[PDB]
Amino acid sequence: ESQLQMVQVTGSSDNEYFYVDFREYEYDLKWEFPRENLEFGKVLGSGAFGKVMNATAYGISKTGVSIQVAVKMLKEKADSSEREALMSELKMMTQLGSHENIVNLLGACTLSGPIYLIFEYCCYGDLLNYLRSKREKFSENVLTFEDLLCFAYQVAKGMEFLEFKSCVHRDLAARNVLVTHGKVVKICDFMSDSNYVVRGNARLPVKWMAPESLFEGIYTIKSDVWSYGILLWEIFSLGVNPYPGIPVDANFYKLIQNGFKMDQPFYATEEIYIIMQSCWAFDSRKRPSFPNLTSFLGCQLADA
Numbered sequence: 001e002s003q004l005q006m007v008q009v010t011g012s013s014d015n016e017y018f019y020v021d022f023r024e025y026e027y028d029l030k031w032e033f034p035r036e037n038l039e040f041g042k043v044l045g046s047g048a049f050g051k052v053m054n055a056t057a058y059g060i061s062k063t064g065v066s067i068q069v070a071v072k073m074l075k076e077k078a079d080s081s082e083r084e085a086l087m088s089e090l091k092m093m094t095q096l097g098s099h100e101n102i103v104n105l106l107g108a109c110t111l112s113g114p115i116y117l118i119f120e121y122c123c124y125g126d127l128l129n130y131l132r133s134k135r136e137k138f139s140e141n142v143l144t145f146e147d148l149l150c151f152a153y154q155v156a157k158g159m160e161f162l163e164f165k166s167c168v169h170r171d172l173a174a175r176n177v178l179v180t181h182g183k184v185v186k187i188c189d190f191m192s193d194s195n196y197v198v199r200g201n202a203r204l205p206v207k208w209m210a211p212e213s214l215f216e217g218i219y220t221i222k223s224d225v226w227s228y229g230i231l232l233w234e235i236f237s238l239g240v241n242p243y244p245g246i247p248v249d250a251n252f253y254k255l256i257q258n259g260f261k262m263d264q265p266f267y268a269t270e271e272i273y274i275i276m277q278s279c280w281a282f283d284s285r286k287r288p289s290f291p292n293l294t295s296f297l298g299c300q301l302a303d304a
């Protein structure tokens with residue numbers, strides 16, 4: 001399953017919607033790539049289902065150079081049910097189009113053998129590991145406060161683009177934001193990690209989840225605003241576990257349903273703490289849009 005899904009709303013209230021299955025749609029062949037031009041690298045991450053590696057793709061760009069890449073693929077010893085599920089993520093990503101703040105799809109290998117899907121390369125890694133790594137040399141090669149603000153604006157216009165395309169990202173967090181050349185960052189998708197609770201066949205990032213997700217399984221564009229506020233806390237904390245010190249247990253569910261909100265993090269202005277509280281409104285109608293967070297932050301940066 002892909003934590004990024006496209007929705008078609010069938011009503012007014014929040015739960016009136018349904019997801020889109022591409023299993024019956026046809027795959028566009030112009031994304032097809034030959035495996036001849038994939039020169040590998042070192043594993044860059046592998047859970048249970050699959051992995052994503054570094055690779056080198058000669059003649060895959062407009063001009064044509066090496067241009068390192070990341071390649072998502074299975075390793076379930078050639079499975080069946082898990083394979084077509086990946087084909088449908090390919091079909092969706094192909095129709096999302098490029099945005100400057102999304103880890104974009106560059107190609108795929110379909111009938112070429114075992115299924116490969118080729119994504120952009122972000123050399124500086126996920127934002128979580130990038131933030132925590134620079135806690136030493138934070139200053140008031142090493143980052144300003146406009147970095148914290150530019151990061152927030154880029155993820156916002158990225159989620160603003162996912163809303164235009166009628167998508168929802170059900171796992172917005174710092175581990176899923178990746179830094180590439182020149183302090184530009186891009187949203188991406190994807191059991192020894194403390195952040196996900198497993199509950200049935202679902203793996204849930206409880207501390208990032210909006211109450212309507214924790215308690216009734218609703219995922220809307222406004223549920224991503226809630227997670228975005230949590231990420232806002234992740235950025236201006238320099239990346240410490242949201243709700244620090246509190247374990248994910250039954251007591252944490254009573255926390256969120258009773259109206260718990262995190263305190264202002266150290267590196268945050270009084271201004272953008274207010275914006276964090278907006279996303280943490282219990283009523284999702286009371287929450288700010290992703291458009292509204294174009295101007296409200298893209299301006300806060302210009303003063304820096």
Ligand SMILES: CCc1nc(C(N)=O)c2nc1NC1CCN(CCOCCOc3cc(ccc3N3CCOCC3)N2)CC1
Pocket residue numbers: 044045052069070103119120121122123124125126129178188189190
């Ligand atoms: C699809 C998701 C993805 N995308 C991409 C990409 N398109 O670039 C990508 N890694 C991932 N998986 C994520 C990455 C983070 N890890 C944490 C532990 O694993 C270290 C990975 O190390 C990296 C992987 C990358 C870049 C840089 C690094 N650093 C290694 C050391 O130097 C600094 C950064 N590349 C979890 C899974």
